[PDB]
Ligand SMILES: *[C@@H]1O[C@H](CO)[C@@H](O[C@@H]2O[C@H](CO)[C@@H](O[C@@H]3O[C@H](CO[C@H]4O[C@H](CO[C@H]5O[C@H](CO)[C@@H](O)[C@H](O)[C@@H]5O)[C@@H](O)[C@H](O[C@H]5O[C@H](CO)[C@@H](O)[C@H](O)[C@@H]5O)[C@@H]4O)[C@@H](O)[C@H](O[C@H]4O[C@H](CO[C@H]5O[C@H](CO)[C@@H](O)[C@H](O)[C@@H]5O)[C@@H](O)[C@H](O)[C@@H]4O[C@H]4O[C@H](CO)[C@@H](O)[C@H](O)[C@@H]4O[C@H]4O[C@H](CO)[C@@H](O)[C@H](O)[C@@H]4O)[C@@H]3O)[C@H](O)[C@H]2NC(C)=O)[C@H](O)[C@H]1NC(C)=O
Ligand SMILES: *[C@@H]1O[C@H](CO)[C@@H](O[C@@H]2O[C@H](CO)[C@@H](O[C@@H]3O[C@H](CO[C@H]4O[C@H](CO)[C@@H](O)[C@H](O)[C@@H]4O)[C@@H](O)[C@H](O[C@H]4O[C@H](CO)[C@@H](O)[C@H](O)[C@@H]4O[C@H]4O[C@H](CO)[C@@H](O)[C@H](O)[C@@H]4O[C@H]4O[C@H](CO)[C@@H](O)[C@H](O)[C@@H]4O)[C@@H]3O)[C@H](O)[C@H]2NC(C)=O)[C@H](O)[C@H]1NC(C)=O
Ligand SMILES: OC[C@H]1O[C@@H](O[C@H]2[C@@H](OC[C@H]3O[C@@H](O[C@H]4[C@H](O)[C@@H](O)[C@H](O)O[C@@H]4CO)[C@H](O)[C@@H](O)[C@@H]3O[C@@H]3O[C@H](CO[C@H]4OC[C@@H](O)[C@H](O)[C@H]4O)[C@@H](O[C@@H]4O[C@H](CO[C@H]5OC[C@@H](O)[C@H](O)[C@H]5O)[C@@H](O)[C@H](O)[C@H]4O)[C@H](O)[C@H]3O)OC[C@@H](O)[C@@H]2O)[C@H](O)[C@@H](O)[C@H]1O
Ligand SMILES: *[C@@H]1O[C@H](CO)[C@@H](O[C@@H]2O[C@H](CO)[C@@H](O[C@@H]3O[C@H](CO)[C@@H](O)[C@H](O)[C@@H]3O)[C@H](O)[C@H]2NC(C)=O)[C@H](O)[C@H]1NC(C)=O
Ligand SMILES: *[C@@H]1O[C@H](CO)[C@@H](O)[C@H](O)[C@H]1NC(C)=O
Ligand SMILES: *[C@@H]1O[C@H](CO)[C@@H](O)[C@H](O)[C@H]1NC(C)=O
Ligand SMILES: *[C@@H]1O[C@H](CO)[C@@H](O)[C@H](O)[C@H]1NC(C)=O
Ligand SMILES: *[C@@H]1O[C@H](CO)[C@@H](O)[C@H](O)[C@H]1NC(C)=O
């Protein structure tokens with residue numbers, strides 16, 4: 026149908042997948058609802074993609090939510106021509122800077138295309154979905170080979186019967202875009218399995234019979250759930266069994282798709298909620314695994330996770346170096362990975378409590394055969410080797426005389442300068458000086474029936490790192506408020522609750538969600554909430570209690 030005037034440099038799906046490594050998501054933008062500035066990001070501007078290219082990414086994934094841009098319903102399901110034009114212009118912002126693109130159908134997946142809901146009209150879902158990709162395929166028919174199409178984001182899928190419906194999603198998609206013509210018959214596509222989960226995909230994905238597009242599989246990876254989602258008090262990552270769990274997940278997917286190009290379309294241990302040493306060990310090992318199993322990774326970034334689009338600053342430059350220079354071996358700060366350990370340490374920090382003396386701090390590092398070249402603080406000062414710090418094996422020691430030029434027994438708590446360590450190769454990790462103390466809350470108790478309706482914001486005086494580590498929740502009689510099974514999760518996991526589901530924080534508050542409050546009212550029992558902070562030196566010192574009464 027569509028007729029393109031120029032030429033099209035055909036590329037195989039293997040080469041496309043090889044050429045996009047690594048990618049970066051334009052998250053919470055064209056996927057935001059109803060408009061691209063409806064969530065946390067402003068209107069997309071082109072300089073964003075300059076920062077992305079400058080950082081070493083070779084591609085951008087471009088999630089688009091179409092739900093709120095239809096100007097007619099059945100049977101045409103016309104998409105707003107201004108929206109199609111906005112998607113097309115932003116793709117042109119990406120490609121014109123030499124970056125590959127992958128554009129999809131995003132939150133439509135659960136907003137209207139959910140086949141697991143008991144009332145879903147599968148006929149209407151299939152018809153609207155065909156019409157949608159016919160229109161996107163028409164608008165984007167003449168894009169270069171650097172533009173690929175992804176079926177649909179994480180489609181909900183619980184059973185084999187649902188898995189057959191996700192396969193049909195891939196088939197309806199291929200038929201629509203080939204019918205739209207232009208260059209689409211030779212365009213690289215990304216096909217999807219249930220939830221974009223490695224296991225559901227392995228179980229139920231079937232290659233569309235007689236497919237003729239060059240095609241790659243895409244999945245998403247947010248495992249392990251406890252670390253990545255900050256659930257049940259998990260604040261560490263890197264044991265031998267954590268590594269084997271991760272390598273097993275990627276290898277069993279590759280094992281089911283031996284000769285198929287595989288895109289890892291989203292992953293992120295976000296700097297917002299995860300501990301940095303565990304975060305950098307996780308990203309390092311994930312990148313190592315994607316190279317082992319020949320997968321191209323694309324990091325998720327919602328605008329607040331990594332790149333600050335208004336300044337070009339990446340909030341976590343160590344992860345970006347790890348993801349963008351995959352042929353280099355990284356020296357990393359060590360950290361506690363033992364879930365039975367009664368104390369948690371991290372070499373991404375130099376911690377010092379208010380009211381304690383200044384002492385030498387030895388930080389164990391994983392050198393990985395790199396040597397340390399230099400250390401420079403965030404004011405520009407290069408540290409004097411063998412005076413401001415000394416190296417012994419994997420240890421880096423900072424003498425008390427040097428550390429006391431940054432803090433004292435009585436200095437104010439908060440974030441101090443950090444140290445950037447330059448090694449022979451690989452990422453340059455960051456050690457963060459934190460002067461900490463036990464935080465205080467404006468309220469120590471409250472009646473459940475007086476704070477109700479909404480989330481409970483409790484104003485807090487942060488003393489050190491302005492981040493919450495987890496929240497313990499115990500009923501008065503000793504029963505856990507939620508999730509019994511955390512009794513098997515060690516001193517720092519027993520009775521702990523989950524980020525966003527149960528607890529949250531902001532600049533001025535710690536937060537207990539409305540569902541946490543309603544869970545106390547239902548239990549009918551006073552519940553003690555122990556807010557816990559970094560360093561997790563033990564289970565009690567660096568914590569503060571709030572009691573919800575009944
Ligand atoms: C936020 O709020 C929370 C909740 O309110 C606060 O946590 C609470 O902190 C307090 C204070 O620290 C804890 O009290 C201590 O608890 C000890 C018993 O704990 C164990 O049992 C309880 C009770 O279980 C009942 O309920 C459960 C429900 O399921 C049932 O299963 C069970 O059958 C019972 O019915 C459990 O709740 C508790 O579990 C917690 O901890 C475990 C880990 O251990 C976790 O896994 C759980 O999730 C849970 O968190 C646990 O199993 C008890 O030993 C202890 O009594 C001693 O200490 C008192 C205080 O001593 C300090 O202060 C003194 C100054 O006055 C100093 O002298 C002292 O050295 C110390 O600094 C003493 O007053 C008391 O006499 C006891 O002293 C004895 O032991 C000391 C230590 O060994 C010695 O120094 C003493 O000399 C003395 O030893 C002598 O006597 C003993 C006994 O006779 C002999 O054994 C010994 O040989 C010797 O002769 C104290 O009561 C409380 O447990 C805890 N609650 C919870 C739910 O966590 C939290 O602090 C707060 N945080 C903040 C920051 O504000
Ligand atoms: C080691 O230590 C050093 C300390 O020396 C650490 O360096 C600091 O790192 C910070 C985090 O990376 C960084 O903070 C950012 O600064 C930006 C401003 O930078 C420029 O100005 C300052 C002077 O003020 C200069 O110093 C600096 O060099 C630059 O010139 C801000 O742009 C950033 O704010 C955004 O992020 C924070 C969270 O990180 C948000 O709270 C904040 O609201 C901003 O995010 C909004 O805006 C973006 C759009 O850009 C949206 O995508 C996002 O959703 C948010 O949107 C809301 O708000 C907008 C309004 O803007 C609205 O449109 C929208 O609807 C939403 O409501 C950020 O604050 C420090 O500058 C940096 N300091 C220095 C000296 O370098 C370093 O991290 C340490 N390293 C490690 C590894 O620990
Ligand atoms: O990590 C994938 C991997 O997980 C294995 O399962 C292990 C993992 O379980 C996570 C789930 O735990 C449930 O709690 C269970 C617990 O697992 C049991 O141990 C215990 O006995 O019972 C507990 C409860 O009875 C939690 O209830 C679940 O919430 C959790 O799954 C995660 O759910 C969140 C949020 O889900 C919401 O919607 C549905 C509903 O279930 C839930 O209540 C709601 O809050 C998901 O967040 C979404 O994440 C996507 C991105 O993730 C996508 O990308 C890659 C795929 O792997 C994902 O499947 C896919 O969803 C994001 O875009 C959305 O915005 C978020 O809403 C998480 O994705 C879910 O992981 O941890 C502990 C262990 O016990 C389990 O064995 C599983 O077996 C593997 O096959 C593999 O899938
Ligand atoms: C292709 O992918 C499938 C789906 O992931 C892989 O099959 C799965 O293999 C794992 C590990 O071999 C099985 O888990 C094990 O199961 C038993 C009880 O279920 C337990 O003793 C073990 O601790 C472990 O959890 C899993 O059940 C199995 N699933 C299915 C449907 O067979 C398969 O291995 C992959 N194929 C290749 C060639 O990589
Ligand atoms: C389901 O969708 C089809 C196609 O739009 C329509 O003909 C049918 O009436 C719908 N079913 C119901 C119960 O609304
Ligand atoms: C695929 O192509 C063959 C022709 O070689 C055709 O006979 C067959 O029906 C097609 N498969 C399906 C599942 O329609
Ligand atoms: C490294 O530090 C630990 C803890 O201080 C110490 O026990 C160990 O002997 C040190 N190792 C070397 C090689 O200096
Ligand atoms: C504690 O109270 C809860 C809620 O009131 C109840 O379900 C549970 O059985 C009680 N357990 C004990 C040990 O008292």
Ligand SMILES: OC[C@H]1O[C@@H](O)[C@H](O)[C@@H](O)[C@@H]1O
Nearest residue numbers: 053058063064065066327329
């Ligand atoms: O926090 C930024 C945004 O995140 C999204 O995941 C939520 O759905 C939005 O409601 C929220 O504004």
Ligand SMILES: *[C@H]1O[C@H](CO)[C@@H](O)[C@H](O)[C@@H]1O
Nearest residue numbers: 361366368369370371562
């Ligand atoms: C954190 O934990 C480790 C041991 O796990 C210590 O070496 C460190 O000093 C801190 O207590």
Ligand SMILES: [Mg+2]
Nearest residue numbers: 052179291325
């Ligand atoms: Mg998402």
